[PDB]
Design a protein around this ligand. Sequence first.
Ligand code: NI
Ligand code: NI
Ligand code: NI
Ligand code: NI
Lengths: 570, 570, 100, 100, 100, 122
Amino acid sequence: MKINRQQYAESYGPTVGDQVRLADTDLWIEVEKDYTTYGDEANFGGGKVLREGMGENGTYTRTENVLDLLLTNALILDYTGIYKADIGVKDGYIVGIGKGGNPDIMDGVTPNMIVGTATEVIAAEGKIVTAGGIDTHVHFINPDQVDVALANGITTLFGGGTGPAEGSKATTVTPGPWNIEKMLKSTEGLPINVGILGKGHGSSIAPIMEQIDAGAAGLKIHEDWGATPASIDRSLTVADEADVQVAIHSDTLNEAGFLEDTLRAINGRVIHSFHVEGAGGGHAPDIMAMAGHPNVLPSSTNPTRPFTVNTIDEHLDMLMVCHHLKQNIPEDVAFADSRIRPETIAAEDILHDLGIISMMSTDALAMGRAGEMVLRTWQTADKMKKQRGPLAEEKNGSDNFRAKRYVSKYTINPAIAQGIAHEVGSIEEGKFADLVLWEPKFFGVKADRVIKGGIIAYAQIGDPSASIPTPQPVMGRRMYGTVGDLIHDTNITFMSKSSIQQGVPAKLGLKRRIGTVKNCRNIGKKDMKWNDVTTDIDINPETYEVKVDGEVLTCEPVKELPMAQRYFLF
Amino acid sequence: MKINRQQYAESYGPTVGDQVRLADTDLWIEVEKDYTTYGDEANFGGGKVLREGMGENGTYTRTENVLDLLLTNALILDYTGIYKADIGVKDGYIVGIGKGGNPDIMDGVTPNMIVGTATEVIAAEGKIVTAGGIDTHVHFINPDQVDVALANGITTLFGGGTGPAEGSKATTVTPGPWNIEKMLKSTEGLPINVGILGKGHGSSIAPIMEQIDAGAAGLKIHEDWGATPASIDRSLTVADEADVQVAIHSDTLNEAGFLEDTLRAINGRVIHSFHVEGAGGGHAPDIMAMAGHPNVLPSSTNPTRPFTVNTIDEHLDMLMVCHHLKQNIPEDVAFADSRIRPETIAAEDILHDLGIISMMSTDALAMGRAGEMVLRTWQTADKMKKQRGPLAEEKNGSDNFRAKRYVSKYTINPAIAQGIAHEVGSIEEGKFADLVLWEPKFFGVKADRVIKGGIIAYAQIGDPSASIPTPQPVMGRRMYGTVGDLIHDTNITFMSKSSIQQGVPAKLGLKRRIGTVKNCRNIGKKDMKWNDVTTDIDINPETYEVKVDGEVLTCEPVKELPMAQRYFLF
Amino acid sequence: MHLNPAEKEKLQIFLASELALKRKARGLKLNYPEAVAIITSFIMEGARDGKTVAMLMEEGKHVLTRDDVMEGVPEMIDDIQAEATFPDGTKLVTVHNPIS
Amino acid sequence: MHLNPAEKEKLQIFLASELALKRKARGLKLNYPEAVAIITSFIMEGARDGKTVAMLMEEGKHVLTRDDVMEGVPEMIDDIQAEATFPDGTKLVTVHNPIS
Amino acid sequence: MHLNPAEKEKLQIFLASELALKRKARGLKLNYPEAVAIITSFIMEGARDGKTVAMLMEEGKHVLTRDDVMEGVPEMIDDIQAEATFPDGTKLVTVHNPIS
Amino acid sequence: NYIVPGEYRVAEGEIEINAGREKTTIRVSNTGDRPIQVGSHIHFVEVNKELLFDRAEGIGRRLNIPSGTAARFEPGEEMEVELTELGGNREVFGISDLTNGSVDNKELILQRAKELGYKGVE
Ligand code: NI
Ligand code: NI
Ligand code: NI
Ligand code: NI
């Protein structure tokens, strides 16, 4: 008995060779392989396969190879592949990717993916499943920003801030041991993973280091606190001892040095260069040259992503508010204007497409949009396909290479940069079960269900008074993973090794899962998945023209994007 | 180099001799002194002064004289003065008022106000900063009342209730050990400081006292529970032993006595007379004579504040609902009508202006508006300036004397009355960092940011999805100080000494900061800052005319107020 | 805008009144929450217009009549209360037996 | 509909603008939140219409004039900012001194 | 009014429909959430009018046509579901493929 | 009579900044090809290496400009600026690591500046 492909895909989701359009873009992903055994697909419901004695095993206790949760028939999009599989979760972690069901009667069941009495089922047939987004440029300014992030598939927030204080409104910084302790306690109520950055400023080691011992997961060097050679140097000395990452927003003003002086202070040590294009901050005009260096892990923030006809006009007032500048001070305006350049924004599109900028991030509420990291990643990829064509590496007319390059920018690469990829950032066995289901028509726009530590934390779902959950109004809502004490088990607070060794969680009464930051200092650009390119980037000081391999990198702004007015009510 | 005054004030906020209009009132406050060193003003942002090696010290650890938080360039309005200073916060307390920055290079830095690695910055230039409001007449009826209070700059709620039970809808009472324990546990989730009043009723000591031992912070005598000579006497005997305050709502009906009988039962002991004018309750018609006595700490509730053309018409139905009265019972209506008198309401305006009524309060949800204590204080002051003129004590054409007299009514005086002024009620070194920032155009109307224990708890802030926090809709929202376990460290539960000694917090699992109520019994009218006047108040039993020093106190109702239709959407 | 909690809530009343007015306009007899919404929004808009509390206490009795509402609705509504910002600040309007 | 948090919030702005426009239509001088709501909703509807950011930066200065608003309102509003989905994605419009 | 949770939520749908109808009236092709809001509010108002579930299942297919909406919107909407209080209590209306 | 809510009525007079401190005027050139902007409170001797001026005259000093403002030098631009004296303890730490102690140690500061290529040391 044979099933035609259209009907197969409609029932079980696509299989090998089938393609799926990402939202309303012209990007197509192709199923590379499928772990199923045709005829033994798992499915749940009235008269379906996952029933006792049938696709559900009735013999084994939870410890005997049985799952807590099976996502059936997922189309996985990940740096590791674009492929069809069941995903098995246990103890809040991904324990199996393969084929779930009952070895009693089914062929090809992955041995630790038994559906048993203990197993919940989520139907992923017809859905795209990705890792939760890892946003490493978060300003903690307004708690309402968490749901905004969850709704666009973000599951980890790394950054700093104490709320709408001017220091936090400008910089991703939670300064000093007391503010850090207070924000670790606040974090107990935030339904998302969190890591906190201390102030990467000082000329003595102890004031910086005590932030790490207090529970910070990293440091932020920001020009608004003095991005001087000394602050750069001391922060990196601390980071090298503590095994945490340093993010830098460099001296736009070139006050104490030019880019080359900042690079000399860094002295080959590992650093994460935030908003590397420079509208969001950095040595004017040439900061983006950072992204050519082997010791730099380069990210973009999102308002320049991608280059559109309105992009420039929004930036001046945005920048002035964020950095607490005054319109009547001519040098404030000159500083702001110096950061905004169509030449570097256009080149930034292309550098992403070439794998020279490795990461995306938001800059939430401080020149960036909390719920648009994933959104703007795919809009950028789509623009680049339209303007540059399919990448040379593509086959079968699919955009799989570009899709892997781009999904890596907001999943695995930020996790690697931060020293947290042992826990999060990809759909791999042994990692925390932070998973996002997307209807393909909404892919990258509005997440269907966001799973945190194996329990749904956020979902687009309807009328709570209705007979079923699908009637209107369908909106993003917090689910049971966020309620009561379950918020502790479904989320991770990432912290330095020293704070963990010193018992900070017990001292503060933290009940969340505690994640260790590690392996931050022994990585480089070569470790950025699908985005590992080092090169000499030349930025003309007169014209701002960007050259790589002797070629000017430029492209046109677009008048329209996908993933925009078809979807949004405002 | 010299800066003209307009430009100076625009950049750093006003300095000595400059005046600022309070909202849209005709009240002007004048800067009395300024702690800065001109040229070394602190400020934060891109290319600004608080940067490492410059205005931020890079040497000292958090313990070495470094702040957790600096509010730069605050215009303080407080009973202690109207003046310009930086405010330094550490461990959740105000530790310095003066000049912050870096002694390396700046003149005149207050020694414990170093901006260091550990220091967050809030820009207060161009803002008025006051102590958080202390509301001592709160009915705990609807938890939604907390945000209402925060939005108008209230940071402490003293009162009673168990929710919308009739006892609580009438009286500020949490009755008995069990209800008190339950509400102490509820308080763990309320993002505001709290103290709870027990039922000040009984003829034996033990039933009253066991409420104090259970964790009450004071008592309420209310006529709806029998404001008899016995209940008055026993409550004051308890209060004198326990060192807590007693609030009284006296026998309007004159059932067991007239005012003189209540005063005889009080017998010179300290008492807080609620809604002393009497619309909110008390011996008809002459209760307001209480406010002349040296042992009485007199407050108003807010719906009579100030006397307007609509004031009388709203009161009868308001009173009938609050006190569970019936429109078809003639004596119920007679009782209600007996409490509502233009003669005493008009005199109440003037008694406030003269410093004879010392405090304001809300009466939240039981003949009072949770979010209008601060609002109506300033409307009263403005009306009095219009009708009475500048006070004789004023100079320079400023309204500083009136402003100090009135700000004291809702900050320091209620704190003193309650025995909590060691912790809260004013901007002074050594007190808890409950601070309210106001844009002058919104002063007394809508708070900008409300700081609780050194972390922002509430703010008027915009779109959480936006690139910056200022885009619409700008509304009042809870901030990180209210989230997770941080709600425990940013708020105080005030309790009796006995309950604290007996380990009630540990017994109930309370994690909030625990404040001790003390020094309540050794104070009088003389201790009410700027409002310390004792005098013989005569109230004519036939005409209700109020006389002080042989002069009838009367004034006209107004048809319009400031701080009203210019500001509110409804 | 600097919306406070009450301003946000009270937007709902205006919205419910607009809904109810559309239902009335297409010929429906109004139900209990519809009738309450209309009279409440009328009061709050009256305050915004600068009417007095006393004016609104009497006008509120003439906004809807029994033929505008379903059977039993007039008897379900003993009174309607609303607070709004008058020119002289927030005041409470109570309308007793608004629909005879 | 799949409403996200901002879509839900921004419905409020449209609603407040409709309220304010009704108040203007019956002859009232508008207050601070009313004026802000009208200009904000105008911007978001302009984005929906497909205008550019630059167009809205200048149109926003001509939506309300000083005779439309109460004394002091023009000086209370230093700028109005709003984000909306343009044909090319979310963008920020800042209108400086919208009412002269 | 005694609003329960669903009554509060469903006010939003009416509001979104009013927004969308204004956008349609000024000549815009409607997007996905706009189209859903209009059809949903139509269903809930139909129930209030006293139509049957069966009537609304078929009327819901004729509220918007493909020329009223942006490219791809008809294919994005497989069905629209709404519950409302009919004369005989709450019922669910499902409209399959409302825009052909 | 017209009410601007929250308006200021500033007093008469002017505010003199950095009163009583010695002032020094010097010429400074941006010899680099990118703009350099210098804040009010940076120890002037520790600014960008490619600013050419008499480095000794920047020791123990900063720009005599309002707190939080800056001087901007476009590429190739030479301008005259006025400096004022640092106050407080007259110590500088960090920044470019040229001082790390008293600003009185002119010889040591200049030796470090020269070794690291800060333009304008004898
Ligand atoms: Ni930055
Ligand atoms: Ni940032
Ligand atoms: Ni009372
Ligand atoms: Ni009361």
